[PDB]
Write a protein that binds this ligand. Structure first.
Ligand SMILES: c1cc(CN2CCNCC2)no1
Length: 284
């Protein structure tokens, strides 16, 4: 049976290579990658691929790989798809490890904006987990030269990671990774997938998709949120995306709110990630 080579960029930046039958569903590849990673809490994760417009798309595990990658390479990244609001409730330390790896990339890429102090805190927990107790015999030198902590490194940031690293003596790796996540989960952009859009009056906005719902940034403020509980139906038509909201108490009619996306593929991609979040993070 005819196999296609698959390459997967792992969260540590390394490459996993395997073959799958060309008619394979995404689940087949995802299962191989998660087995490679010893990952059992798979529900939070996914593979991404890049479409012909260079846009990030989730590989639907329930659909054929060939019908998603189409004319592109069988080239994927392993990513967190659903950021858990409380990482302490994950059952396995290794799940929390992979989530830390994703957040470290979210921070360095600048997708996850972060104060100086929180960049230093997060960096100090990572160094504690991976290097263990601070070596003071080092006293002023750069044993952290290989660690990337921020979109922009400064000497002051490096100094602050080191000062905080000294304070974590005796902390074990899972402990350090749990403290990393306790800080990161509180960041206002934690787990927020951002999409360029316009409102019904043509004003530039960003739509954020996350556990808590659909966020609208009408300025550079979170000027609004639609919690998944309020949302009855998500749809797209042409370059338009719509959310149908349940009637408020005593109100006669539902409401439908409409957004303009950059093109049709961008409207469909937003609809798909909203439906997925709405299902995964729905009130039960
Ligand atoms: C679009 C897609 C991605 C994530 N991966 C997909 C697999 N190839 C490498 C990039 N980033 O922008």
């Amino acid at each position: 049976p005819k196999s296609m080579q698959c390459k997967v960029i792992l969260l540590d930046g390394s490459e996993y290579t395997c073959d799958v039958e060309k008619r394979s569903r995404g689940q087949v590849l995802f299962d191989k990658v998660c087995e490679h990673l010893n990952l059992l809490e798979k529900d939070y994760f996914g593979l991404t691929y890049r479409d012909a417009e260079n846009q990030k798309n989730w590989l639907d595990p329930a659909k054929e790989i060939k019908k998603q990658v189409r004319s592109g390479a069988w080239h994927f990244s392993f990513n967190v798809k659903f950021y858990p609001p409380d990482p302490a409730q994950l059952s396995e330390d290794i799940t929390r490890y992979y989530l830390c790896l994703q957040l470290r990339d979210d921070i360095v890429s600048g997708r996850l904006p972060c104060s100086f102090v929180t960049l230093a805190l997060l960096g100090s927990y990572t160094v504690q987990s991976e290097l263990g107790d601070y070596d003071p015999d080092e006293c002023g030198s750069d044993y952290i030269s290989e660690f990337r902590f921020a979109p922009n490194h400064t000497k002051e940031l490096e100094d602050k990671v080191i000062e905080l690293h000294k304070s974590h003596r005796g902390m074990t790796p899972a402990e350090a990774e749990m403290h990393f996540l306790e800080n990161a989960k509180k960041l206002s952009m934690y787990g927020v997938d951002l999409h360029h859009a316009k409102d019904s009056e043509g004003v530039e906005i960003m739509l954020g998709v996350c556990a808590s719902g659909l966020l609208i940034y009408r300025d550079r403020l979170r000027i609004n949120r639609f919690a998944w509980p309020k949302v009855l139906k998500i749809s797209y038509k042409r370059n338009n995306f719509y959310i149908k909201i349940r009637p408020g108490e005593f109100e006669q009619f539902e409401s439908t709110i409409g957004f303009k996306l950059p093109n049709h593929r961008a409207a469909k991609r937003l609809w798909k990630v909203c439906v997925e979040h709405h299902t995964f993070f729905r009130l039960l």
